[PDB]
Amino acid sequence: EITCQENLPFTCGNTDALNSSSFSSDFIFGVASSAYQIEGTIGRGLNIWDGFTHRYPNKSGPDHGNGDTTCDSFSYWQKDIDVLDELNATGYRFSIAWSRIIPRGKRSRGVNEKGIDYYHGLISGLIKKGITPFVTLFHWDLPQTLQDEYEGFLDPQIIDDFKDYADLCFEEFGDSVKYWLTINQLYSVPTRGYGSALDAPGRCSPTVDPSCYAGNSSTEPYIVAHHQLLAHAKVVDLYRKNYTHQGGKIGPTMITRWFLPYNDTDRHSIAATERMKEFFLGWFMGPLTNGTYPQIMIDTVGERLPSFSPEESNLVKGSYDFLGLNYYFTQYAQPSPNPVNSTNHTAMMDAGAKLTYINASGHYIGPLFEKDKADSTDNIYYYPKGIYSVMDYFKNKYYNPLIYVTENGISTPGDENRNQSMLDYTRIDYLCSHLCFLNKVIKEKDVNVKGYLAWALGDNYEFNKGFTVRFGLSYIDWNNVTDRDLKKSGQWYQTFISP
Amino acid sequence: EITCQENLPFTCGNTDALNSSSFSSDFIFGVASSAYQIEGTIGRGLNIWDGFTHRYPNKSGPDHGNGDTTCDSFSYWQKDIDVLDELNATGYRFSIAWSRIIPRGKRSRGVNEKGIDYYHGLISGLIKKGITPFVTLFHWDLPQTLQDEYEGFLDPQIIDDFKDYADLCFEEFGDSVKYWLTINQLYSVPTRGYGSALDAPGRCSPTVDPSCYAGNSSTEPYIVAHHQLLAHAKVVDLYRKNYTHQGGKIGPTMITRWFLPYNDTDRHSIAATERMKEFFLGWFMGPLTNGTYPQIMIDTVGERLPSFSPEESNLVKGSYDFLGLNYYFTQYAQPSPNPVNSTNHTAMMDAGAKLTYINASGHYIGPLFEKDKADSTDNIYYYPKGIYSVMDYFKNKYYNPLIYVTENGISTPGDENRNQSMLDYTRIDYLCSHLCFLNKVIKEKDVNVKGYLAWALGDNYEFNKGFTVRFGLSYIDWNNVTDRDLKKSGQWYQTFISP
């Protein structure tokens, strides 16, 4: 019988008690990255994260940081491989920058051979060290040209441009890459990119944020989400019809959270909690498992919710071999009004829920996850049991899928000096406590989880935060980015992997 | 009788001997800037100078600098006005960033109202201080979307997108702006952007520079130059047909140089010198004055030189009310082979000339202009008489045009400390020696020159050089960009203007 801790102090950093041998022999352990966050702009065209961070520097991070140079994995990809080799990792998730291989967006405009060569060399280097690549086609970095031609995922033109990009990736890299992710965190671009305008491309209703160049936060999230699902599904169909000889697997990436009632004896909070599951997870998992959006979304969102045709429904339903599930934290849910006629209405209001990290009796859900220095009542707290609850829910609700945990990690402040930054015991605690619950759910609930990739390989540009936080298991000096030095967490993870 | 110095030491920094009163009462004196170089990316979309500097950081400058934040004239435009007011300047040349007012490139995709407001406030502030705006529509910063959709000026689609952009500018700003420049330095994008790939977008033949993503240095410069002329001419026709009520004037910007024979008794060097005038100046001025390219270009370039239809010829011929002439330096010319079958052939080779700053007897043409620390035999030297020779030539060869000198200036090294940087006596010498010759040519040759704008108002991002050189008449601290402090040159220029 497995017992796992939910509160500080944690004792799962002892590899005598928790290590890779606790999991099945074939289980993959590694780390993750994304292209905007690590590569730099050298050698690629411009994408909407370049555009957004440059047009709206205060939205890029408090330091106005961006991905222009970052950790320079364009130059230092071998050093990334070296970290993975030091870890004895068996997996690495990275993304392909669309703008590096097709700078002009549309494949018929030509490819960048040198960009293709960059990923060939990375892939070959990984495989030579026994590391399985997990490759994200689209980690938010849409070529700027496509956003300017037709507003990107706002328009159905995205589907064929994404398909042709993906086809090039399968053609060039699929002989070696056997695990593909289509779109990173399906929920995020619709809501943050087109709802709150916290993320690229930065569209919203005028009264939500007067700096947005255009948008409608009530309608566009739904349009974009719908196009994401269709573009994803078209790529999965292309993969499974035209690249079956490659013997690989493909799936989407979800951001997952668990949700608990703010007041577990209040029917209204219980209802809000179940609505959140539907609106947060079901928005995408309903289509992916059934070809339809959840009924509560149909009912609430009404004419703002697009319909799938019968052909589209069939294309989207079942459009995965596995799910990449990202998991960071859990929220309490309580009811909230949905003012659909307000000029500041957002899609996110349609769930009719307010989310907190403290429940009605004043209980904080778990240890600190992210401090918010401008408003401490907005601090985020984590909840290790949430990974158990999410995986159990996916198994039970969503037809026992094959799952890889494609991100899980925690930040430390960029204000810490290097010695403090390397002494990242809070990261060991977060990672181990989640791994304990992941082992527990696999054993107790028989969830088909076959790997775990911690966020992040190394310090990088963090969307929305610049270089003001660090997520890496290895440390990068922003004054001299060449080295990636394993932190205490990376050293712990090395021991966990090879105990 | 006016006597002007050609060699150090110069004594024209004495405003007792040379000042604004030496020129006609109406003559405009000011300074110049461009949008990529000064504004920053905040509040605008991405353009090909963002793309180029980010994809090819070693081509942005030795420091890998770029226009992301620069002097932040987005925030500090009032401080630019303040410099101009301190100078008692009567003119200011600035550019509109296309990506700030139409981030999606094509006008039908929507405009950025806040971008429009930015230029309205600048323009209104200038006029309130008695400063005449000279506004460049296109200072190289093409929206990235257009380059990615159709490769920008490589394709005739540029013409209508440029026209619709210009129409928006005339509509929004032409009630106040009475001097418009279409395209900055017509020669530069074809040759550097599409020939040598030193400049955005960075296209060339594969053996010219293997880093180029695509291109053909032998053909594309000509295509791009042809489209520039057509796009320019379509905008001038639009202006003069639809905006005549505004009572303003429009013209192109030329980069001018003079050319002297490397050996003034050698017929081959004399011939190369005359070819250079045709290939450098006539490439554009032939079309602008006659609707045809120079015969030597027709003959040499052959099938690589596009033809104008009779309608196009008529549109381009006479498509200016004035010329903005930029002038920095003069070169000696000697013959050079034109290897049209070589895989590394460039359009620039078609002139059949090699350019130097030292003549056959070892004479350097004038004082140092720009030191090249990697190769000192590649140092640039200036030649004050060249402004006289250029203006005389334009009057005689090109039908006595109205001229404004739209740039003239010199750099100092970014390695200098602030006190050295503010003690910019080399800049006084360059500016005064050229102003002396400009007065001389107006008086002696009756060239219709009606203003002079020195490059640059303040230190900025220099194309190709990052922040490794400074051109400003006012100093900017890159650690805190708010202030623009007049250098010795700016203080001199203040006295020259109001002696």
Ligand SMILES: *[C@@H]1O[C@H](CO)[C@@H](O[C@@H]2O[C@H](CO)[C@@H](O)[C@H](O)[C@H]2NC(C)=O)[C@H](O)[C@H]1NC(C)=O
């Ligand atoms: C807030 O969360 C706390 C902690 O989960 C809940 O308190 C638990 O309540 C259960 C059922 O009453 C008790 O058996 C436990 O002993 C309590 N745990 C502790 C740490 O107090 C609490 O019920 C939640 N409040 C609401 C209103 O939902």
Ligand SMILES: *[C@@H]1O[C@H](CO)[C@@H](O[C@@H]2O[C@H](CO)[C@@H](O)[C@H](O)[C@H]2NC(C)=O)[C@H](O)[C@H]1NC(C)=O
């Ligand atoms: C190189 O440039 C120098 C300077 O312009 C030329 O020298 C001048 O030559 C003229 C005509 O012979 C003489 O009257 C001057 O006195 C010379 N000036 C000085 C400073 O020497 C020289 O002829 C040029 N060489 C060539 C080969 O063209």
Ligand SMILES: *[C@@H]1O[C@H](CO)[C@@H](O)[C@H](O)[C@H]1NC(C)=O
């Ligand atoms: C940040 O930038 C936007 C312009 O993009 C401006 O609207 C907003 O006021 C600025 N935010 C703060 C908090 O200053």
Ligand SMILES: *[C@@H]1O[C@H](CO)[C@@H](O)[C@H](O)[C@H]1NC(C)=O
């Ligand atoms: C607009 O929304 C903000 C945040 O969503 C809220 O605090 C404010 O009350 C809203 N105003 C109206 C008019 O509803």
Ligand SMILES: *[C@@H]1O[C@H](CO)[C@@H](O)[C@H](O)[C@H]1NC(C)=O
């Ligand atoms: C930068 O870091 C690398 C790796 O430690 C080191 O070899 C190189 O000398 C350092 N550069 C400077 C300028 O210190």
Ligand SMILES: *[C@@H]1O[C@H](CO)[C@@H](O)[C@H](O)[C@H]1NC(C)=O
């Ligand atoms: C600069 O960058 C390009 C890649 O864009 C590379 O081809 C070239 O070798 C580098 N130049 C030098 C001098 O290192």
Ligand SMILES: *[C@@H]1O[C@H](CO)[C@@H](O)[C@H](O)[C@H]1NC(C)=O
């Ligand atoms: C290619 O050109 C470079 C510079 O243009 C020159 O130095 C070299 O000799 C040329 N090679 C051939 C094959 O002509």
Ligand SMILES: *[C@@H]1O[C@H](CO)[C@@H](O)[C@H](O)[C@H]1NC(C)=O
């Ligand atoms: C930056 O420069 C401005 C103008 O001199 C000054 O007022 C401001 O205090 C300076 N900022 C810092 C942080 O020194």
Ligand SMILES: [Zn+2]
């Ligand atoms: Zn940047």
